[PDB]
Paper text:
CBD is located at the ends of the fenestrations that lie closest to the central pore, and protrudes into (and blocks) the central transmembrane cavity, just below the sodium ion selectivity filter. There is experimental electron density and enough room (third panel from left) for four CBD molecules in this region, although one would be sufficient to block sodium ion passage, as seen from the HOLE depictions and pore radius plots, which show the size of the transmembrane pathway with and without different numbers of CBD molecules; their blockage clearly provides a mechanism for channel inhibition as well as a basis for understanding the concentration-dependence of the drug effects. Each binding site is comprised of 11 residues from three different subunits in NavMs (shown in detail and in different colours in Figure 1D & E). It should be noted here, that this region of the apo structure also exhibits some electron density (but has a different size and shape), which has been attributed to detergent molecules. The (2Fo-Fc) electron density map of the CBD complex clearly indicates that in these crystals the site is occupied by CBD rather than by detergent. The CBD-binding site is a novel site, near to, but not coincident with, known analgesic binding sites in sodium channels. The binding site is located at the pore end of the transmembrane fenestrations which enable the ingress of hydrophobic molecules into the channel lumen, hence this may also provide the pathway for CBD to enter and block the channels.
Numbering used by the authors:
A (entry chain A), B (entry chain A), C (entry chain A), D (entry chain A): -1 to 92, 100 to 262
């Protein structure tokens, strides 16, 4: 099929990506201008028409891809499905957050798409650290609700309220002037609860963050190498393994020969 | 003993771990529901019955382990002793924090158990940094108590009070608007005390945290490798040492042969 | 040209750099003294005369460089152009920030100039992470303006106002006591907006910062090596590549010979 | 001299260090107890007598060292001079901070002494980053004093006041609710000043901190190795250099032989 192959090659061109990137930027600029509550009716109609035009250009773009690659081939990519959901949601009249269309900058620009991929692929490796943090938060929230809920109902009156103020305490935001000094006026030993909670959760959150950053950076760096040269660099352990194999080949020809 | 070996293999199965994991989750969910002060008497009785059931299932689980492995073999593991303490404490009627039973998720799930092990084994390596921080805190607290205790008794009136507000100052929480600008109204040179205290303690705490995270991550990564393949990767220094040994063997067969 | 070569060698001397460094420090000290609103008219005239003298010394210094290196040779350096802009701006009477002349300490001291160079050369490598953060900020600001602008106009009444309070929220500054608890009094589910915003942006900002620091440190370390020894250290991958080439040369002389 | 050699070996024993460590701890405990303003006269006299005893034990300890090693040999160590200054300052009656005697725990315990040594030896390597931060702070303080000093004299009325509130702003402490939103009520564009100041200084401070931590950890790790085994591990570049030398020796015996 020469027509399908001319469309797929048009889609894959740098100028097609640049034109779609320009329409995403324009659509996001009119949605940002539409937040201004002082616009005239004519200005609002005008900007809403550019939003309706921007959306239809994405509809033509997506339909072109579903014909050039096929339904099976298009929906086999997570980024094509993501783009399809964003544009198909707009054809649902009864949602209300059109600005999420600017996320398509991530899916459309490959260098930005590799940053997200690296962050997503790094998440499984830190799953046990995230589960440990989740476990500490849950136990702390139950303890805080039972200990301080009757005396401090706005902050600890229920599990949800305790989870919220423990997240604020973990971020160090007014943890002492705002929360723990007011609580110690009633419960003088409360520092025994909150100070170890802060020590354990700030250490665990920083471990979770560093674990993601280190892995994500190395994954994205490997993905960038593959996109440019077709392959990525081999690990230092594999480089030293191939040297050992070459050393054993030389050793074999020294005892025999 | 075929009975003991059938029980130990039942205990070590993935489905036994999955059922115990489900009971820990259920027990934690009813303890969290029991924080709600608006429940009916019947709902409270109902949830308290699920807690009593969850506890007895853990009693059967632990007793099965003490019979399949033996008293010496069971108590030779730090994680078995930890599980035993958590369940045996519940049989002590006169404590009040049943939610600590959710910590058994760490001991029961091996990937979570290796995160904790890595963090614990990393603590000795940062002991001198933690002692240095402790020494700075103690000296600062004595200085702050003597300098500001009479003028600012709520924050520095005693050693305990000074330790608490120096921990708040180290976390940067309202250190200036809340503490040091009010103190400089009376003691204009107080910034000479508090600014170097913040510089030294935030640097030392970050060193302590990074030291733990780096070591803990590498230890847990080695422990994960041993659990899957039976062995961990050798250090790069040991890889280069074995190459030098192979180089000397080739060198020996070049001068002689 | 012996005169041009004697001037260029005078300019390149350590004592010329030390004298210019002293004049930048003196100029910055008089500009700092000139901030004091309690000075006498004579003291102000005196300090303003030292500023006019300091500026003319820089004019002689720059003119000497433009004659010893030539217009093409001088303006071929980004640091010479930067120095020229700083001193030429002062000859524009109608701007108002003479203290920017102290930035010349960075351009004049080579070790400080290499720290900046390392930070600047690290920026392209983190461009996709910075663009991702920018995209999240923009989407969040539009969402916050539409959701909270009518109820909270001081913080979210317009796009600019929302960008500002989201930057404050990302820095964790009074995010809960100051912004999100007041907003949840009207919109109880606002935590669904702000807590994921904080999680995503603090992770992304830390990734952006670490990415810059790691690259900048390695670039500056390579630039320092080149300035002292004429060359920098080769990467470990290139060291292992040259060993493989030497291994293949030994392998060639083992099968043939 | 058998007497001098028996004293030096007594001084260098683990039990002498343990006894001096116990006296430093005891001295610090009585100085902390002496902060309590509710003690009786007899309790104060009692604790002050233990402080006078603790000091004299350090005087005997230091005098023993000056006789066993000699004046030249003792004062040739930075840690011996540091210990001498701390104890000799106490014999100066006219200062007031005896708690600084607890710093001797760092000088007396070798593992703690190596943490400090690693941090001190790391400082020269980050000197250009610290100078860059200092330069940004100075320029910002002059700009802030001239821009906001007349309208906001408590925070920016003078250079010293501006340096203080810029350090608070850099630590993110109430930077917006406390400082920049009150300043933007008068100067609406002030965010153009403060937001880039925060971006640049938090990045630079984190670079300064990471640079210290990374170097200090590696230096202390090398110093610990030398103290235990007499030598430290060689760098990976030097390990690969010795392999290249062995490769050239094998290459020499392949073409000739
Ligand atoms: C690592 C640092 C650890 C600091 C721990 C401080 C413990 C002492 C705190 C304390 O006793 N109070 C808090 C100070 O108000 C007193 C009140 O609970 C009552 O008066
Ligand atoms: C690295 C940054 C270091 C900043 C250090 C600032 C020192 C100056 C602080 C100062 O003198 N005051 C604090 C400002 O109120 C004045 C009051 O103590 C009195 O008026
Ligand atoms: C990772 C931690 C995640 C914590 C998430 C907390 C969610 C619950 C927050 C909540 O429901 N409220 C905030 C507490 O006031 C209640 C108010 O919105 C209304 O009453
Ligand atoms: C990277 C994030 C960068 C955020 C930058 C926000 C710029 C807009 C700030 C602004 O215009 N105002 C501050 C909001 O009050 C308005 C006031 O100065 C006047 O009304
Ligand atoms: C100074 C503070 C508050 C920081 C920096 C130091 C440490 C060790 C950790 C702190 C931290 C938090 O406490 C919370 C969050 C948000 C985490 C959202 C996902 C769970 C990020 C974060 O870096
Ligand atoms: C921005 C802040 C406050 C952070 C991030 C930057 C640095 C350098 C250090 C700061 C910090 C603290 O000051 C205190 C704690 C709790 C330590 C509990 C165990 C001793 C964690 C923490 O990361
Ligand atoms: C405890 C806080 C606030 C810190 C430390 C922990 C994390 C993960 C991130 C936080 C952070 C911010 O949220 C914002 C800025 C300024 C960024 C300006 C350029 C975009 C620096 C910064 O380190
Ligand atoms: C969340 C905050 C405030 C932290 C963590 C994130 C960053 C990037 C930097 C911040 C920071 C400061 O702004 C100031 C200090 C004290 C420095 C004293 C010596 C100059 C330590 C510090 O870690
Ligand atoms: Na903070
Ligand atoms: Na705060
Ligand atoms: Na605050």
């Amino acid at each position: 099929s020469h027509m399908s192959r001319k469309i797929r090659d048009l889609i894959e061109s740098k100028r097609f990506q640049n034109v779609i990137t320009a329409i995403i930027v324009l659509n996001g600029a009119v949605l940002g201008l539409l937040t201004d509550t002082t616009l005239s009716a004519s200005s609002q109609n005008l900007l809403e028409r550019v939003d309706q035009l921007c959306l239809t250009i994405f509809i033509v773009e997506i339909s072109l891809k579903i014909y050039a690659y096929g339904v099976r081939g298009f929906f086999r990519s997570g980024w094509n499905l993501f783009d399809f959901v964003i544009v198909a949601i707009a054809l649902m009249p009864a949602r209300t957050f059109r600005i999420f269309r600017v996320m398509r900058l991530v899916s459309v620009i490959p260098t930005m798409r590799r940053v997200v991929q690296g962050m997503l692929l790094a998440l499984p490796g830190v799953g046990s650290v995230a589960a440990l943090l989740t476990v500490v938060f849950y136990i702390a929230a139950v303890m805080a609700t039972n200990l301080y809920g009757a005396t401090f109902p706005e902050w600890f009156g229920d599990l949800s309220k305790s989870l919220y103020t423990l997240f604020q305490v973990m971020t160090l935001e007014s943890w002492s002037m705002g929360i723990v000094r007011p609580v110690m006026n009633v419960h003088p030993n409360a520092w025994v609860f909150f100070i170890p909670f802060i020590m354990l959760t700030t250490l665990t959150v920083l471990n979770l963050f560093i674990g993601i950053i280190v892995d994500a950076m190395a994954i994205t760096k490997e993905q960038e190498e593959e996109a440019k040269t077709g392959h990525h660099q081999e690990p230092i352990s594999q480089t030293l393994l191939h040297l050992g194999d070459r050393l054993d080949r030389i050793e074999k020809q020294l005892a025999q020969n």
